[PDB]
Amino acid sequence: IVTEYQPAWVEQFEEEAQALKQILKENCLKVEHIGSTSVPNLAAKPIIDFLVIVEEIEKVDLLQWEFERIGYEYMGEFGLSGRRYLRKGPIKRTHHVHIYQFDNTQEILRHLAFRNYLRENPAIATTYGTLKKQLAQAHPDSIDKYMKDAFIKKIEKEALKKYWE
């Protein structure tokens, strides 16, 4: 379910980001907070999204069971080339980790530009939050129907243009 923005999401991000870095070690170039919970004052599902950028993606497979040990399902690419995707937890969904190699610039910028653009455009973020709240009031049953797509693609495009300016 979508809630009003929770400042605590930042705490949650930073705590888990440290946990992730302990596992990834030198292969981890950067962990970024992404997705709606990374945009102050944006209404969102309380699921923290992590963008983890690594030197070598195949090396992350060696760590599958370390991630399982801290509660992740290790999903592999899960449909996106070059990604390693992690989700937890088994009781309720709380953390989504999107791991990419440093040379996957399209995916890395898709996430960072989208975030940066919403942070700089509160009116657009408000439009997005309002839409999400409206959707939840229409599909409480279906997360499939819930999962905004045309709006997100439009904004991602505006965001990537803005990224270079």
Next chain:
Amino acid sequence: IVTEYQPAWVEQFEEEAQALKQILKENCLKVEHIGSTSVPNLAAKPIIDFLVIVEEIEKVDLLQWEFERIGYEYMGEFGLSGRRYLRKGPIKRTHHVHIYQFDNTQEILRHLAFRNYLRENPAIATTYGTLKKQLAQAHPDSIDKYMKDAFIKKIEKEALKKYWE
């Protein structure tokens, strides 16, 4: 021929960047100085490289003859998907313009990361300048043999990793 760094290259870049913007108008999101002449104190061929980022690449074709009017050969992709490449002039080579659409993140970051990394790593820039000077002392006849490739790919990779940190 490779010369020691010329601070005037910055002047040359800014003057022509304005000229390019006059032609490209609203389609131009950003003009960046790239390549060796954009790295202060790096020895280089005195050819200014421009990275032009646009909303719509196909729209640039409408401007081919405007670019010719200011002295460019309009080269199209010239072997790179999504690029529009311009070179001038007819008497001596002075300006190379590399135009890409905003969503060509791989090419845009290849250039910007490479530049930023050399700017932050003077020892690496010195290695690169020394190599270029050495090469010129070996192939004064052949620009083909001159045109460093393994070194550049290595540095581009280091640079893109650093870009995210």
